[PDB]
Amino acid sequence: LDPGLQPGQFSADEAGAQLFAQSYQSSAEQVLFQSVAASWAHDTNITAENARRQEEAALLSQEFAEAWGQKAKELYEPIWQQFTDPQLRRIIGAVRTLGSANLPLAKRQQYNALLSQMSRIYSTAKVCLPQTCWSLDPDLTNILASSRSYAMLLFAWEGWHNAAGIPLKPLYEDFTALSNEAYKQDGFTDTGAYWRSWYNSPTFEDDLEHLYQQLEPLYLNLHAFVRRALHRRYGDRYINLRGPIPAHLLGDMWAQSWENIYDMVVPFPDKPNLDVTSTMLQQGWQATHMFRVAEEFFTSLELSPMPPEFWEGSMLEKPADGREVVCHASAWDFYNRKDFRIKQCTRVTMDQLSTVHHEMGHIQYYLQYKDLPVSLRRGANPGFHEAIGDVLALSVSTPEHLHKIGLLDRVTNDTESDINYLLKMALEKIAFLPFGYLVDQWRWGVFSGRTPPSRYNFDWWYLRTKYQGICPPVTRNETHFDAGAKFHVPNVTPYIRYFVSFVLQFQFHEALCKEAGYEGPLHQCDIYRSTKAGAKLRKVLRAGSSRPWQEVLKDMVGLDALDAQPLLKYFQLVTQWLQEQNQQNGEVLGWPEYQWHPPLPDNYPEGI
Ligand SMILES: *[C@@H]1O[C@H](CO[C@@H]2O[C@@H](C)[C@@H](O)[C@@H](O)[C@@H]2O)[C@@H](O[C@@H]2O[C@H](CO)[C@@H](O)[C@H](O)[C@H]2NC(C)=O)[C@H](O)[C@H]1NC(C)=O
Ligand SMILES: *[C@@H]1O[C@H](CO)[C@@H](O[C@@H]2O[C@H](CO)[C@@H](O)[C@H](O)[C@H]2NC(C)=O)[C@H](O)[C@H]1NC(C)=O
Ligand SMILES: [Ca+2]
Ligand SMILES: [Cl-]
Ligand SMILES: [Mg+2]
Ligand SMILES: [Zn+2]
């Protein structure tokens, strides 16, 4: 490591730790910036040379973290928890956690290789036919979303899970062992305990379960309503009105979001859909204007505009020069207090306008906490960033807001269109809740050893049926590794944050709507042009992770805890309607025939 980047001499007391932390920040910004810039250069210009430069930068960052982490532990391990400065305790406490840097040199290289291999297996997995082959993006995704042929959906679902999961299993086993070995040296019983420690809650798992108990009735009613609709479409041979739903029929490879089957379940189909896409096109909107419109939403709250560096450096539309890029939208903090960017192959549609606002919500977060020490430039807990992005989108998606920005002449007030709106939202927000909760329950069991490799798939499908009420549409056994067929598993990205953020965002919404002086149905609230809501946002965002998330949340919503009631209050109208619908049809809530699996279609897979 360059001598100017490794730590010098510092004294083993709090005053010395302040100097240590300031010197850490100076070098850390350089290291962090070069890593983000190298990822940016690759993700906006995918070449092998750029991929190589990115790996160089990542390994420099790892080397930096180990050098400063070992120094921090040598000097402050027995004393940092008694420092009087709480932000210093947060900084030092993070620096002394080495993760994979605790592994012997060859194991550390193996750990990094496993991460790269697992990521590559997932991104190149494909489903071949009895011939060309399909890729997850966009081939299989579009089949799951729009095909209504049971056997076709089945072929894509089975093909993908076998292709992505099976080769991952031997690697995931080795990753699990090395990951645990590394974090045991940081003082954690296993990797899952380290992930959970980010929430700094002695009763995190109990708190989560109590939350889900309050949410489960809404999911069960949505599940039974949708299961009825599927029964009408595919018949009694493939749909058990008292059993789990076959996992490939909900519009999504993982059945985590059901909005792609909205057309089957529309409460009131005779009402016009809400889609202002064509009006955007007639008004001449393009990607840049969409971002300027999003920017004006933030300035209307007296939040910060996008700085010139954002407009100069961002990739707001797919480059015309034929460059290969990552088109999925993402927001970038370069950790130099200067460069902040969005990378998105923006298209001119209503849904994309909502995404622009969401992603700019991430940028606004970055800009508000950019004067904090680098270690504290993150959300108050790992679920805050998505919750901030999503709460802004909750306002911007309403017909009320679309009217105000010139995209919808007349706002209807018939209750039937309200139900349609809420049911569409529920297919996205409520259907996801069991999946967001269960993924890390599976990984926590794997990390702790309660789920050895011999029961990876058994415990995966236990959780999937228990919470989502689905079953695999073909028989599975322990040669299959269906957890591996979800991006975040081989790419080792924690997941409970997303369940947390789905709860949080409705807590945020209620608080901000009240601060905005809004009165009426929560799902019609738009905080646009409320400087009082903007002030309340500003105080959460500028805090970064400098303070306990429970206290930041208390200042914002008046409660120091996650709470499911604001979500239930948002959806109360459609929850009521679903209950009535299910009781009119005499539905069984749940899946009492838990052993049920559907049969294979005749002569599978010689089909169209
Ligand atoms: C585990 O399953 C594999 C895969 O077989 C498929 O999945 C099963 C659950 C079942 O639905 C089968 O009908 C499917 O074909 C089994 O490996 C297959 O074994 C058969 C013998 O019946 C053999 O002819 C195939 O060549 C095998 N297929 C592959 C891809 O290897 C395996 O036997 C099952 N049991 C165990 C313990 O692994
Ligand atoms: C995309 O990345 C490639 C690198 O892989 C860039 O090509 C390099 O361009 C510089 C000049 O900027 C040359 O000095 C190098 O010799 C080039 N490398 C190769 C392998 O040809 C390319 O310019 C980038 N494209 C854009 C639009 O930024
Ligand atoms: Ca997503
Ligand atoms: Cl998390
Ligand atoms: Mg959406
Ligand atoms: Zn986001």
Residue numbers in the entry: 1 to 131, 135 to 611
Authors' account:
Angiotensin‐1‐converting enzyme (ACE) is a key enzyme in the renin–angiotensin–aldosterone and kinin systems where it cleaves angiotensin I and bradykinin peptides, respectively. However, ACE also participates in numerous other physiological functions, can hydrolyse many peptide substrates and has various exo‐ and endopeptidase activities. ACE achieves this complexity by containing two homologous catalytic domains (N‐ and C‐domains), which exhibit different substrate specificities. Analysis of these structures provides important insights into how structural features of the ACE domains are able to accommodate the wide variety of substrates and allow different peptidase activities.
Here, we present the first open conformation structures of ACE N‐domain and a unique closed C‐domain structure (2.0 Å) where the C terminus of a symmetry‐related molecule is observed inserted into the active‐site cavity and binding to the zinc ion.
